[PDB]
Each structure stands twice: as structure tokens, then as C-alpha cells.
Amino acid sequence: PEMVRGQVFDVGPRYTNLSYIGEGAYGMVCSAYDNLNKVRVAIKKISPFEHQTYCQRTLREIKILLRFRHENIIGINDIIRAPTIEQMKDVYIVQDLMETDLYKLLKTQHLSNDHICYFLYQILRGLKYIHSANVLHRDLKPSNLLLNTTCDLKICDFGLARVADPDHDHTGFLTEYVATRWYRAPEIMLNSKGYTKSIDIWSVGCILAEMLSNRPIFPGKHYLDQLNHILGILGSPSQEDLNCIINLKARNYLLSLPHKNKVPWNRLFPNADSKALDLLDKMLTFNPHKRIEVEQALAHPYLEQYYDPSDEPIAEAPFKFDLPKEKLKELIFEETARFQP
Ligand SMILES: *[C@@H]1CCOC(=O)c2c(O)cc(O)cc2OC[C@@H](O)[C@H](O)[C@H](O)C(=O)C1
Numbered sequence: 001p002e003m004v005r006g007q008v009f010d011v012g013p014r015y016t017n018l019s020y021i022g023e024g025a026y027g028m029v030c031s032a033y034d035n036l037n038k039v040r041v042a043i044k045k046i047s048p049f050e051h052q053t054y055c056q057r058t059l060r061e062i063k064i065l066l067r068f069r070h071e072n073i074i075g076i077n078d079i080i081r082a083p084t085i086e087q088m089k090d091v092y093i094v095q096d097l098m099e100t101d102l103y104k105l106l107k108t109q110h111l112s113n114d115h116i117c118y119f120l121y122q123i124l125r126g127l128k129y130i131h132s133a134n135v136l137h138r139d140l141k142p143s144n145l146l147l148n149t150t151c152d153l154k155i156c157d158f159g160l161a162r163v164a165d166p167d168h169d170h171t172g173f174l175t176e177y178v179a180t181r182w183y184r185a186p187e188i189m190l191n192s193k194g195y196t197k198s199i200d201i202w203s204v205g206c207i208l209a210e211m212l213s214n215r216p217i218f219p220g221k222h223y224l225d226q227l228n229h230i231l232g233i234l235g236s237p238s239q240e241d242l243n244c245i246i247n248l249k250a251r252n253y254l255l256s257l258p259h260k261n262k263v264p265w266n267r268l269f270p271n272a273d274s275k276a277l278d279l280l281d282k283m284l285t286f287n288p289h290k291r292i293e294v295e296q297a298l299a300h301p302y303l304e305q306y307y308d309p310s311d312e313p314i315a316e317a318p319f320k321f322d323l324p325k326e327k328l329k330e331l332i333f334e335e336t337a338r339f340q341p
Contacts, residue, residue: 004030011043011080011092018043025159026054027090031097041077042098046091048332055328057159058091062335064135064158067317072126074098074146074154079339088333099149101156102142102207106214113273115151116211120279121298121306122153123204128294130155131197132314134164138194140203141183142210163319165195173249174224179203181226182216186234187288189227190250198288201297205283212269212276217284234286235262241287275302 001010002018007028009018015032022029027045034041048054065076078094102119111119123145130137137144139160146154160179171193178184178194185202188194209217217233220226231237236259245251265277272280279302282292292300298307323331 004028007045009043009045009092010090011094014078015041015043015080015094025057025157032094034094040097042095043080044093044095046093047089048091049089049325049329052323052325052328055325055332056323059328059332059335060161061158062093062332064161064319066335066338067319068129068133068315070126070129070313071152072122072154073129074156079336081333081336083340085329085333088329091332091336096148096154098146098154100147102145102147102153102211104143105147106142106210110214111211113276116208116276117273117302117305118151119145119147119153119211120204120208120276121303123155123207124294124298124303125312126153126155127200127204128298128312129315130161131164131200131294132318134318134320136162136164136195136197137200137203138162139179139183140200140207141180142207145207162195163321164197169193169195170247173247173253177223181220181223182206182218184226185288186227186230186286189224190254191245191247192288196288197293198291201283201291201294202288204297205280208276208280208283209269212272212280217268230286231257231260233263233268234284235260237286241290244287244289273302275300278302 001008004018004020009030011032014035016035017033019031021031021042024044026048029042029044031040032043046058048058069075074095076093076095080092082088137158139157144156146156169192171191173190176188176193178188178199183203183206185199206217218226218229220229237254242251242254265280269277279297279300283297285291298312
């Protein structure tokens with residue numbers, strides 16, 4: 001058993017010569033050599049079984065990724081675990097080895113407009129597949145976008161994903177915490193549980209802005225502060241958009257604010273392509289019902305060099321629609337059985 005930074009990695013004998021990469025949800029990510037396929041791979045160690053929410057995140061991801069097959073979604077090549085439930089303490093998920101993630105890339109690298117266009121195209125192409133499966137990713141952010149050496153992009157981490165449920169999306173003011181804060185749509189803080197596809201388009205718009213400037217566009221320092229940053233750039237919502245918000249507490253909070261003017265995108269991003277800024281505006285639209293959808297975004301003039309609906313596939317088998325951790329562990333054991341001897 002090889003150890004990496006005081007952490008056992010029981011992945012032998014198939015996977016050897018381990019190297020640290022970073023941290024996932026319930027454990028670390030390493031690279032390793034695959035002695036069967038004679039290539040290096042990435043391996044994520046997960047230790048979720050003490051906690052019901054961890055088991056939930058682990059089961060969601062495994063169930064989804066084993067059904068999905070798409071060029072812009074990183075797949076599961078192998079799952080390593082003990083042969084019995086009694087002996088199962090950790091799970092190792094083996095995936096293609098990528099070169100970097102967009103979070104690390106944006107810390108030091110300026111993106112050319114050609115790279116921004118290609119990265120955005122690939123994010124939306126993968127997102128089209130996800131949404132066609134009636135699935136919401138719900139945690140899109142640069143660290144969940146992986147790049148290989150030729151800048152092919154893959155979406156990672158479905159542990160926060162859910163099946164879309166727009167009829168049950170409404171909730172009260174200041175109750176929801178969906179997504180990582182900086183990528184969270186304004187309606188999460190106002191009246192939404194994050195159960196509609198527009199949640200993901202907002203996150204993509206935040207990622208686009210960050211690719212244009214190498215800094216987060218809405219860097220809220222805490223929960224309600226996130227809405228301060230959003231409104232500081234978008235300006236005050238229109239009467240029509242407020243009439244959309246029937247919840248009285250959320251609407252009255254917005255009405256209590258002083259009038260704020262919109263900051264023009266081309267003042268925030270003076271070197272950006274004007275077509276990129278037009279698409280950015282449509283993704284970062286306050287009203288989630290008016291916000292552009294993934295297939296419309298793919299057809300936007302900014303992406304005309306890449307757009308090809310017949311090469312933008314959808315899912316064959318969409319997902320249609322309280323468990324103690326003991327039952328979740330059994331479910332995880334069952335879902336991973338296909339990779340055993
Ligand atoms: C993604 C989990 C899989 O991540 C990877 O496979 C991965 C590869 O292949 C290369 C590099 O450089 C990073 C990387 O993941 C880094 C993770 O920390 C990632 O950002 C994210 O946190 C995650 O776990 C989901």
C-alpha cells in the first residue's frame with residue numbers, strides 16, 4: 001500500500017507510482033500509473049461512510065457518472081474498494097488524468113479570446129448533455145472544470161447534483177445555500193431552492209466573466225453579501241422582474257434598496273470581444289425565466305466557429321425523478337459492483 005502525504009492509497013496492484021494532485025470532497029486526488037492500460041490516470045480517494053450526507057454526495061456522483069457518457073464530462077474508468085461491505089472503508093474513483101483545472105490555470109495565466117471561446121463552447125456542450133438528462137450540476141465553478149494538455153475541457157464533481165424539479169423550486173427569503181457562494185444565482189438568496197436549469201447558466205456566466213479578467217466577478221464575503229455584489233453590477237431589478245417574485249419578504253427586501261444603476265460590461269471588460277459580452281449579459285440576467293438556456297447559448301454568435309447541433313449530443317436515458325447511512329453504504333457497494341473481478 002503506497003502512502004501519499006500521510007494517506008494510505010490501497011489501489012494496487014493495477015495502479016502504482018502515485019503523486020499528489022489536490023483535494024476532493026472526502027479525500028485527496030492523486031495521479032498513478034495504470035499497469036493495464038500503460039497510461040497515467042487520476043484517482044480520487046473518498047471516505048464517506050461515517051456520515052449520511054457524505055454517503056449521499058458519494059452515491060449521487062457515482063450513480064450519475066456511471067449513466068453519463070460525454071466528451072466534456074469526466075467519466076469513471078474504474079472504482080476500487082474492498083470485496084465486502086464489512087471491509088469497505090474507502091472508495092477510489094479512477095478517471096482520465098488531466099493537466100490542470102481552470103481554478104489553478106486562472107491564478108497565473110491570461111486566456112486568449114480564442115481560448116475563452118473554446119472553453120465556453122465546451123462547458124455549454126457538456127452542460128447541454130447534463131440538462132438533457134434532466135440533471136442539474138449545481139456546483140459549476142473553475143475548480144470543477146478540468147483541462148488536458150490540448151485544452152480539452154471536462155466537467156467534474158456531481159456530488160451536489162439533483163434531478164430538476166421546477167414545480168417545487170419556490171422557497172422563502174434567505175433560506176437556501178445551493179452552489180459555492182461566488183457562483184450562486186441571485187434567486188437562491190431570494191426565493192429559489194436551486195431546482196431549475198437556470199441555476200447552472202448563472203454559474204457559467206460567472207465563469208465566463210472570470211475567464212475574461214482572471215478575477216471572480218461577484219466575490220461576496222459571506223451569504224447576503226453575495227446579492228450586494230450581484231446588484232452592484234446588474235443594478236436594480238425592473239418592476240417586471242420584481243413582479244416575478246411573489247414572496248413578500250424577498251420582494252420587500254429588494255424594494256427597500258436605493259436605486260442602483262447598471263455597470264456596463266464593456267467598462268468592466270474593455271478588452272473583451274463584444275459578442276462575448278452580449279452572451280455574458282444573457283447568462284447573467286437577473287430574472288431566471290428570461291435567462292438564456294443552454295441550447296440558445298450554444299447558438300449565440302460568439303460561438304459560431306464551433307456551433308454544430310448534430311455534434312452536441314444529448315442523453316439517451318434521462319433521470320426520471322432520509323436513508324440511513326447503512327442503507328446508503330449498501331447502495332454504494334451495489335453501484336460499484338461492476339468494477340469487481
Ligand atoms: C474532480 C475530480 C477529478 O479530478 C481530476 O481528475 C483532476 C485531474 O485529472 C488533474 C488535475 O490537475 C486536477 C484534478 O482534480 C483536482 C480536484 O481538486 C478538482 O479541482 C475538484 O476539486 C474535484 O475533486 C472534482
